Amino acid sequence: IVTQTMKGLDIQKVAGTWYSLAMAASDISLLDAQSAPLRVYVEELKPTPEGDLEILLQKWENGECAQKKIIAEKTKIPAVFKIDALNENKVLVLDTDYKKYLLFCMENSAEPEQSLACQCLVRTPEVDDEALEKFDKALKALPMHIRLSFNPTQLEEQCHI
Amino acid sequence: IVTQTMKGLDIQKVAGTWYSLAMAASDISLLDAQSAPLRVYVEELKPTPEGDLEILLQKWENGECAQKKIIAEKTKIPAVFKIDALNENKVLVLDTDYKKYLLFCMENSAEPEQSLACQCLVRTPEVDDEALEKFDKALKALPMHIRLSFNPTQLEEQCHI
Ligand SMILES: CC1=C(/C=C/C(C)=C/C=C/C(C)=C\C(=O)O)C(C)(C)CCC1
Ligand SMILES: CC1=C(/C=C/C(C)=C/C=C/C(C)=C\C(=O)O)C(C)(C)CCC1
Numbered sequence: 663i664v665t666q667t668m669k670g671l672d673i674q675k676v677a678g679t680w681y682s683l684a685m686a687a688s689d690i691s692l693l694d695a696q697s698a699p700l701r702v703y704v705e706e707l708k709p710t711p712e713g714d715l716e717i718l719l720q721k722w723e724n725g726e727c728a729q730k731k732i733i734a735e736k737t738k739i740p741a742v743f744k745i746d747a748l749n750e751n752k753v754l755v756l757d758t759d760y761k762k763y764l765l766f767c768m769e770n771s772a773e774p775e776q777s778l779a780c781q782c783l784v785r786t787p788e789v790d791d792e793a794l795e796k797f798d799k800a801l802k803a804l805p806m807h808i809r810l811s812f813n814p815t816q817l818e819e820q821c822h823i
Numbered sequence: 824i825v826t827q828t829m830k831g832l833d834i835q836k837v838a839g840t841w842y843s844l845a846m847a848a849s850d851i852s853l854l855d856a857q858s859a860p861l862r863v864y865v866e867e868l869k870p871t872p873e874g875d876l877e878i879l880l881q882k883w884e885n886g887e888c889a890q891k892k893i894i895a896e897k898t899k900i901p902a903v904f905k906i907d908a909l910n911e912n913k914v915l916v917l918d919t920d921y922k923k924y925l926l927f928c929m930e931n932s933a934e935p936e937q938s939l940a941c942q943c944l945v946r947t948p949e950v951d952d953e954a955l956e957k958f959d960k961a962l963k964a965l966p967m968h969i970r971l972s973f974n975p976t977q978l979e980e981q982c983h984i
Contacts, residue, residue: 699908748853748910748938749912770910
C-alpha cells in the first residue's frame with residue numbers, strides 16, 4: 663500500500679531518542695481512543711548489530727500509561743522490517759535524515775486498507791514544520807482518515823497527556 | 824474456518840475460574856516459544872451485563888509472566904465475540920457445560936489459516952480426559968500443527984512454569 667521507502671538507509675544511524683510529533687491511520691478507530699490499537703508513542707529506537715529494530719514505546723492500557731518494547735526483524739529490504747506477531751505486520755521507513763526526523767509506517771500485510779498507521783518522529787520536542795510537511799506529502803496518496811498532532815508540552819509528558 | 828459453535832449458549836454462565844488444560848495452533852510459531860504470540864493462559868472469564876466477554880489471562884512477556892485483561896465484544900451470534908484490536912480477531916465458543924469444561928477458538932478473519940488457536944478450558948487443575956477428547960475431536964477437521972498439554976503442577980503455576 664505504501665509506495666515510499668527511502669533508499670540506502672543506515673538503520674544503525676536512527677538509534678536514539680525520538681518524539682512522535684504526529685500520527686495518521688487509515689481507520690479512525692486505530693487512533694480514536696486513548697486505548698486505540700495503534701496509538702503508540704515512541705520512546706527510542708535501538709538497532710541491533712545483527713541489523714534488527716528494537717522499538718521502545720509508551721502505550722495507554724487498562725487505565726494507565728504502559729511502557730512497551732518491540733522487536734522488528736530485518737528483511738532483505740533495508741527499510742522494511744517485520745515485528746514478530748499475529749496477523750503479520752510490517753514496518754516501513756519512508757524517509758529520514760537521522761538527526762532531525764523520521765517518517766515510518768506500519769501496515770498489516772494482505773490488503774492492509776484495514777491496517778495502516780504512519781508517524782512523524784522528531785528528535786527534539788519542538789514542532790518541526792519542515793518534517794510535518796514531508797509527512798503530509800508522503801501521506802497524500804495514502805488513504806488516511808485520522809491524523810493527530812502533539813504539542814511540545816504533550817511531548818514531554820508520558821503518553822502525551 | 825471453525826465450523827463448530829455451540830447452540831443456545833449462556834455466556835453469563837461461563838463466568839469464573841478456568842484452567843487452560845491444553846492449546847492448539849495452525850502454525851507452530853503461534854505457540855512455539857514462551858513469548859509466542861497466542862500462548863496465553865486464562866485466569867478467568869467475566870461476562871458483562873451488556874453481554875460482552877472480559878477475559879483474564881496471563882502472558883509471558885519481555886522476560887516475565889505478565890497479567891493481561893481483554894474485552895471481547897458480543898455480536899449478533901451468541902457464541903461469537905470480537906476482541907477490540909488490529910487486523911480483526913474473532914473469538915468462538917465451540918462447546919461447554921459451564922461447570923466442567925469450555926472449548927473456544929480464536930481466529931483472525933479473512934482467510935485465517937495464518938490465524939487460529941484453540942484451547943481446552945477446565946474448571947479444576949486436574950487433567951480431564953473427557954474434555955481432552957472433545958477438544959481433540961473438535962480440532963480433527965482443523966488444520967493444527969502445534970498442540971500443548973499442561974499438567975496439574977504446571978496449572979497451579981503462573982504462566983504454567
Ligand atoms: C502503528 C505504528 C507502529 C507499531 C506499533 C506496534 C506494532 C506496537 C506493538 C505493540 C504490542 C506488541 C502490543 C500491544 O499494543 O498490546 C510503529 C511504532 C512500528 C511505527 C509507527 C506506527
Ligand atoms: C489465542 C486465544 C485467545 C486470545 C488471546 C488474545 C487475543 C489475547 C490478547 C492479548 C493482548 C491484547 C495483547 C498481547 O498479547 O500483547 C483466547 C483466550 C480468546 C481463546 C483461546 C485462544
